[PDB]
Amino acid sequence: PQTATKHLFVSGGVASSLGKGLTASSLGQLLTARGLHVTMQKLDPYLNVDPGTMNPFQHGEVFVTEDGAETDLDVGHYERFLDRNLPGSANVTTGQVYSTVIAKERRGEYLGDTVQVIPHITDEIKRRILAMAQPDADGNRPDVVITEIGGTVGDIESQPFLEAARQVRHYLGREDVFFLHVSLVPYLAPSGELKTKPTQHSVAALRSIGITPDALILRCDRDVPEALKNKIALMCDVDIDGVISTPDAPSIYDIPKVLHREELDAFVVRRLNLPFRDVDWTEWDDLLRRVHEPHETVRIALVGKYVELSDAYLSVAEALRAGGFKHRAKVEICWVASDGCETTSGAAAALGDVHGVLIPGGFGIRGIEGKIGAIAYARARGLPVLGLCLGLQCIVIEAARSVGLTNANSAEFDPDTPDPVIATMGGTMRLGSYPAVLEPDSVVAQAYQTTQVSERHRHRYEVNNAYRDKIAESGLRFSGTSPDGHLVEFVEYPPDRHPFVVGTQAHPELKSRPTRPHPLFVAFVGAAIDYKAGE
């Protein structure tokens, strides 16, 4: 039988860039491995109502849920570590709260009461939090909700969320609410010692707003001496079980071992009185083997538009590497800047060194001819290609230009093109999960091993249905469509035209999990390994 849904807030002190996200994700992973139905939530502090306005080349990708809600990329780590789909409710922001309360004000639904910050805003936040305890579409209720509070304790940027957390702690009571806390432990080079004083000043600032931390996670470049853990337990009044060393791990997938080796999760389960059951590593030891024991290295070029910040492609890169792990191959990514590839001599100079090329999406970018040139090169050179979203549109433009439709373009990039092979259906902006059907015994059907698939979408332009028969003169099969056949979903060249050249409009990288890689990235790495073996 299930008790009340516990809440487990996480807040950062001293500094940002300490890994609250991956730490909370790893805690969710461990609780999942015990068999609890964990779910997760992020409370972003910024006022953007949704991230579709944000420049991804500075703030990373935009994740898309099943229900087509745009969310912070941080939600991706929670999905990947849980292997669970999360609702669009998983990402609250200050912008959603303030614009909700001001909308209800203008519509007059507060009966003319004065709209204070307290209680109206903090009750709305508390409601957005407690909604996660509601039963899912199957009627199951989660055991634990982990809620990463954004910003830093003491930021004016976060005070309303921490007042809401305080109120939740009042109404549910300490049997059912737990606070983790994450804080920096700097190393000083002239003296050669770890200093706890910033963590004491952090927990003092946290207590000044009425939250009591039940455990500390100490972020450090070396294992914290027991002689400092005891001092922290003295000066923070944190039970000495709950001062946890957490070095900088070798890789993000090692962090669950770090947290388990300090036995954090056993203390969490004991403190919340959740149904205690043994951890089974059998699902994750094999991952750590594949991660640490690569049989071979294989290089994939990724033809990004701008590549000085790699975080703009995080989930693409992680989906590639998750594919690599399926073949026990260390996928290494050659970050290739598309604007170097607009000339075939530059394309040859960049791309000739690799065993495959991948065309990632690029919603909202301008100027794609570099990607088309890179694809035309890769076809002539025989390099395997996968095109994610804009990737399919560049592949289709390349195919049409190969059959002489020289001025062919997307209506997005040349509204005056005489041959809009990609055109607006601004037309219906498709978002979220839609069904698709595969040509039976197509190459994609051979990969998925089924005719029925579903994918997450974020595009408003489509293959012009009048051109399908013309484009098929290239040999390009339209090997998947909408169930009515009205919309194009996949394209491929035949197996004897090229070994593997596929595109989709989807973002298949969003269905990646390291224990369950996406079929197309597995097949693409299989083709890249076969190219390595043949060359």
Ligand X SMILES: Nc1ccn([C@@H]2O[C@H](COP(=O)(O)OP(=O)(O)OP(=O)(O)O)[C@@H](O)[C@H]2O)c(=O)n1
Positions touching ligand X (CB under 6 A) are: 16-23, 45, 116-118, 151-152, 155-157, 190-191, 195-197, 235, 246, 248-249, 252, 255
Tell me whether residue 115 or residue 466 sits nearer to a second copy (CB atom).
115
Among positive and negative, which fits the CA dihedral 144, 149, 152, 153? negative
Lateral strand order in the sheet of 419-424: 408-410, 419-424, 461-463
Query: Which residue in 2, 3, 140, 204 binds a second copy (CB under 8 A)?
Result: 204
DSSP 223: P
Q: What are phi and psi of 501, to 5 degrees?
A: -135, 105
Burial degree of 503 (CB within 10 A; 0-12, 13-18, 19+):
buried
- Residue partners of 161: CB distance under 8 A and separation at least 6: 43, 45, 94, 125, 149, 150, 151
Q: Establish if 129 lies at the interface with a second copy (CB under 8 A).
A: no
Do 454 and 433 form a contact (C-beta atoms < 8 A)? yes
18 labeled part of a ligand binding site: yes
Half-sphere exposure of 516 (CA within 13 A, CB side): 11
Touching a second copy, residues 42-61 (CB under 8 A): 45-49, 53-55, 59
Do 29 and 257 form a contact (C-beta atoms < 8 A)? no
308 labeled part of a ligand binding site: no
Tell me the window of 184-192, 416-424, 447-455, 472-480 that interacts with a second copy (CB under 8 A): 184-192
Partner from ligand X, a second copy, none contacting 113, C-beta within 5 to 8 A by type: a second copy
Total interface residues for a second copy by CB under 8 A? 67
Tell me whether residue 44 or residue 419 sits nearer to ligand X (CB atom).
44
CA 242/CA 263 separation, integer angstroms: 9
Q: Establish if 248 lies at the interface with a second copy (CB under 8 A).
A: yes
402 labeled part of a ligand binding site: no
Cα–Cα distances (Å) from 196 to 53, 205, 214, 259, 510, in that order, read 40, 15, 17, 20, 40
Cα–Cα distances (Å) from 137 to 86, 99, 140, 264, in that order, read 12, 27, 8, 32
Q: Establish if 222 lies at the interface with a second copy (CB under 8 A).
A: no
412 labeled part of a ligand binding site: yes
249 labeled part of a ligand binding site: yes
CB of 45 to a second copy, least distance (A): 7
Q: Which residue is nearest to ligand X (CB)?
A: 19
200 labeled part of a ligand binding site: yes
196 labeled part of a ligand binding site: yes
Triad 501, 505, 509: Cα angle to 5°: 80
Catalytic residue among 61, 389, 462, 518: 389
CB of 82 to ligand X, least distance (A): 16
CA 177/CA 484 separation, integer angstroms: 50
- Residue partners of 428: CB distance under 8 A and separation at least 6: 460
CA 358/CA 344 separation, integer angstroms: 17
155 labeled part of a ligand binding site: yes
Tell me whether residue 252 or residue 365 sits nearer to ligand X (CB atom).
252
Tell me whether residue 1 or residue 190 sits nearer to a second copy (CB atom).
190
CA 458/CA 495 separation, integer angstroms: 29
Partner from a second copy, ligand X, none contacting 237, C-beta within 5 to 8 A by type: a second copy
Catalytic residue among 457, 459, 507, 518: 507
Q: Establish if 230 lies at the interface with a second copy (CB under 8 A).
A: no
Tell me whether residue 22 or residue 180 sits nearer to ligand X (CB atom).
22
Partner from a second copy, ligand X, none contacting 252, C-beta within 5 to 8 A by type: ligand X
Nearest CA to 271 among 229, 228, 212, 200? 212
Amino acid at 464: N
Q: Establish if 466 lies at the interface with a second copy (CB under 8 A).
A: no
Query: Which residue in 108, 139, 426, 534 binds a second copy (CB under 8 A)?
Result: 108
Q: What is the 3-state secondary structure (H, E, C) of 135-194?
A: CCCCCCCCCEEEEEEEEECCCCCCHHHHHHHHHHHHHHCCCCEEEEEEEECCEECCCCEE
Q: What is the CA radius of gyration of the chain?
A: 25
Q: Establish if 287 lies at the interface with a second copy (CB under 8 A).
A: no
Tell me the window of 187-195, 366-374, 391-399, 483-491 that interacts with a second copy (CB under 8 A): 187-195
Do 223 and 188 form a contact (C-beta atoms < 8 A)? no
Cα–Cα distances (Å) from 34 to 106, 263, 279, 339, in that order, read 47, 13, 5, 48
CB of 170 to a second copy, least distance (A): 5
Tell me whether residue 207 or residue 468 sits nearer to a second copy (CB atom).
207
389 given a catalytic annotation: yes
Element (H, E) at 290: helix 282-292
Do 45 and 73 form a contact (C-beta atoms < 8 A)? no
Query: Which residue in 101, 266, 279, 403 binds a second copy (CB under 8 A)?
Result: 101
Query: Which residue in 66, 83, 157, 332 binds a second copy (CB under 8 A)?
Result: 157
Catalytic residue among 124, 163, 262, 509: 509
* Tokens 């990463």 found at: 148
Return binding residues: 16-22, 74, 148, 155-157, 195-200, 231, 249, 362, 390-393, 412, 460
Return binding residues for ATP: 17-22, 74, 249
Return binding residues for Mg(2+): 74, 148
Return binding residues for L-glutamine: 362, 390-393, 412, 460
**Catalytic residue numbers, as ranges:** 389, 507, 509
Query: Which residues form the interface with a second copy (CB under 8 A)?
Result: 14-19, 45-49, 53-55, 59, 94-95, 98-99, 101-102, 105-106, 108, 110-118, 120-121, 152, 154, 156-157, 159-160, 163, 166, 169-170, 184, 186, 188-191, 193, 195, 197-198, 201, 204-205, 207-210, 212, 221, 234, 237, 248
